[PDB]
Amino acid sequence: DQLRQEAEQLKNQIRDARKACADATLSQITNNIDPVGRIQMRTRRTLRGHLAKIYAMHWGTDSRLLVSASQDGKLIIWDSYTTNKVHAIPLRSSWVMTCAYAPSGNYVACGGLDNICSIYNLKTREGNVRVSRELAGHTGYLSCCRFLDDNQIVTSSGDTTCALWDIETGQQTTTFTGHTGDVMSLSLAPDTRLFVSGACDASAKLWDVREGMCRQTFTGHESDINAICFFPNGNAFATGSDDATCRLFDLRADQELMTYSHDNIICGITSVSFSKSGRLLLAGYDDFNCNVWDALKADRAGVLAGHDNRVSCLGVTDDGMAVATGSWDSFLKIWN
Amino acid sequence: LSAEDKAAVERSKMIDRNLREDGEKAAREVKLLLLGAGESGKSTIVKQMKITGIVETHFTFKDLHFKMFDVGGQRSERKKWIHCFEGVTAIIFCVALSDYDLVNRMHESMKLFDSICNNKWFTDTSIILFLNKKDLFEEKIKKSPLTICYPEYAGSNTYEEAAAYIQCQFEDLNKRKDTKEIYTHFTCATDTKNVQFVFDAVTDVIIKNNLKDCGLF
């Protein structure tokens, strides 16, 4: 009917409202602050032990343990200070594209092409690691399992949906529908009240955890979105895409703030994560090297070229001590 | 230096031993991706092996362990998860021959073959092409001509010439002939003649992998 015309008029109204609340870009605002300088960070540790391409990693809230999953059928929980392997949990299905380490540290979730987020209970009796709960109900492929608490987990899949699973029941509480493409990433706000999902429709949507409905939708990318991460203040988030640029948005102004393109990089981004203060935006690329951007001046402030394959997972600790990048050459460098 | 960290490092070393042993065990295991069109003979191929989301079938043949990954269960954008299969031993492609009724499945199979044969990942992974359902294909071609799908087919309306035309028309889609070869085999309903062919077409890639890892070149 005319509802598509009405929707186009409404989107035009949204764009006009956004341009009515825009006065100066972030580059104009921060054109007077001094730059961060070159950020030379060396490889302190190197977590060797996986037998295939590493696709995910999530640091612990204690900023020491990190779980990383690879296609060799296993995800390994490393003591990053001493390069040890605290645990080596073998998967039921070797195809894994995500992993998470619970904030309390008791649980580890991981998911892949098996359409199940399997949650392992670490700090149990009997010494070994057992499946606490295998959450099934997606029809695509899980790209990001992320923990809210020990009992709630938000999983974004390839059926264009996110979901909020209650672990002890196993049934998903709220299903976040509204995307048109596969949802490739997910990132919780620091207060765990909202989150953002970036999908393959070049859009990042801000879902409300407690309600179950999207609040804001951010467009501006030309290609698929492979990564997303909240700014530590909680009122902004970067967005890594296949357009070879990260885009820093913001929630309160509901617009695009900054674009991080560069002529020397042409292939996409597989992982994005801010620093602790948020001034440095570390983005893992698929041209084998990570890039560290001065997120208030868009100047490429560092290069991390320790990998000889695609950097698939990037993670900055909560206290900001180090940034570990794991790639497809089975290595988890820990830069600092 | 180390107080319990000696025992932690010992646990890490035992974990390393288990990881290396499992890597040795699963590095000699043949991985076969299984792709194809909808409602095709893929399920028939899996049934003929003597044993939602991705499905893995394990079977031993000639004292060789094959994991065969039927991944077509999940319907999503293939470009975001096909790089997980960079490094499969072979790609068993499947084509139903006797289908022209969905709104033209053979053209869809050709599009899938063109899209999967020229990936940046699958340059060296050989493609084992299967052409299923020869009897129903022959009945269909004796019932309805090939001109409904390919107008430019010039020749007899018989089995042999049309089958060779379809086989060549699938093979020529590859733009890297020297890196990999399409081992096209007519599956039909033949029993114990398919797995031997899979073994024969996979031993060459295994020999190439042995040559690459042994350091000869």
């Epitope: 343990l65 645990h87 | 107080a3 025992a7 010992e10 035992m14």
Partner: single-chain antibody, 233 residues
Framework: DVQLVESGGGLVQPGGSRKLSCSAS????????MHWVRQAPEKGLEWVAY????????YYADTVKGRFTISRDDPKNTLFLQMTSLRSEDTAMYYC??????????????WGQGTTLTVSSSDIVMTQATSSVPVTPGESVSISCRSS???????????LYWFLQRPGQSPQLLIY???NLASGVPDRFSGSGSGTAFTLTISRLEAEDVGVYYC?????????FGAGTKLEL
Amino acid sequence: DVQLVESGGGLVQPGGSRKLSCSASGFAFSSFGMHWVRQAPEKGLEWVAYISSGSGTIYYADTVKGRFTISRDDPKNTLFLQMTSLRSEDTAMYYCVRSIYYYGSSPFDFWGQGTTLTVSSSDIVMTQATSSVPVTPGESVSISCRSSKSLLHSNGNTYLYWFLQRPGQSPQLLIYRMSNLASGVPDRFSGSGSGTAFTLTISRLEAEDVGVYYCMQHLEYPLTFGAGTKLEL
């Protein structure tokens, strides 16, 4: 249903030989470093021996280094201590003790039932500040423990373990690395201290909480226990 049950022991002539064997029913035995720890009939605990996982590292107490040998059968989940030349001071109750060592683990978590063994006829000295303290239920009491050497290793954590042994019961882990409560103990207990002086503090005492409290060091082998502070209701 974690269950370590020992078997063997009993009466034996001095200088003879006897084999103890604890079956480990209910947990993943092969991942666990095991210990044998003995308790004299009216004395404190003494560490005897330790096997790592996979038997890659074995330690013995210097007193019994050579007269005892220790082994594990992982497929049948059993731990063996073959005792040779049983002298007069080996009459004791033996417990085989579970212990897993990773980051944030709780070694010495579980203690077996233990079997008695009656015969006929620089070590870090860990010392308890006393041997008995009067106590009433509902009162917070502090138990001190003194160490020969500073247990604060360079990596930050001090290796000291507080155990409680109920009368007629196997000891249970209470506190590991002087601050972390074991899985299954209430939040009453709290440990504190510097690298040398250590203190357990129990608040809001109950009836069944009385027993003998041992402080163990784990910085270096042998793992000398404490003399044992006892609480009487």
